[PDB]
Amino acid sequence: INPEALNKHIAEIIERATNEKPRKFLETVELQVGLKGYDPKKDPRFNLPLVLPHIAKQNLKLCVIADARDADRAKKLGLNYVEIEHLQQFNKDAKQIKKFAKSYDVFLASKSLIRQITVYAGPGFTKAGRTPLPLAPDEDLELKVLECKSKVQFKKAVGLNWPIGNVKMPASEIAQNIMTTLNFLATQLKKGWQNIKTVYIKSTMGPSHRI
RNA sequence: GGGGCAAGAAGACCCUUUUGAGCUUGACUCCAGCCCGGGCCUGUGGGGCGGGGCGGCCGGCGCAGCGCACAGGGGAGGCCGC
Secondary structure, three states: OOOOOOOOOOOOOOOOOOOOOOOOOOOOOOOOOOOOOOOOOOOOOOOOOOOOOOOOOOOOOOOOOOOOOOHHHOOOOOOOOOOOOOOHHHOOOOOOOOOOOOOOOOOOOOOOOHHHOOOOOOOOOOOOOOOOOOOOOOOOOOOOOOOOOOOOOOOOOOOOOOOOOOOOOOOOOOOOOOOOOOOOOOOOOOOOOOOOOOOOOOOOOOOOOOO
């Protein structure tokens, strides 16, 4: 509606399945604000670290397939590459292009499998909306996957949990109280700040209540 | 008193003038006057009745399902008594 229409901030974030004390695994917070999706990086504002370097958030599956390049980077793990290249039928017909899982934070697709890369293995490789960054057949990826895990864009709000200040804090230690999480997004850029309801919430180990 | 076309008097008769005046109308172009609406002057109320801001209340089967997962969902933890 308008840039400061959500004048009241996230304020209390401790209120989900709080019950006896810990709603989630602990007093960890998955309560957050979801986005409209009008912009991917401008309106929502990709953020600088939300707090001190934290965890990959949802802890997505470790099954990235992009490219081997140098084997030692992650050969045993399979994190460097999963062998879906024997299934080379994917470009002609994408029968199992994303059938395994879309859970991984990044469905990395490199130039190794670029033969099979169109839209099924190209943009939209993971039907679930997130962002991959495969480096090159010439140089190793794996080491660099900084802008997607751990520091998560406001675009991945509807489909992911978010630590916007933990349940542990009495009252509020986010917004004005902690500016690491709230800073760049004073307002949603051109978009009116208000999106859906008071907050999306999008909780994990809790009800993802929409108000 | 026959004439001096005797004198009046820059003919009002009939024209002409890109000369007028009084009058008329249903000429052209308009103006006072009046009627008619909307504002302002110009407050304090009661309403009807919609709107209208708040302002509760509830939603919700391709369901393949553990089950009207509305979608958006999501974790494997807590506190329905999972």
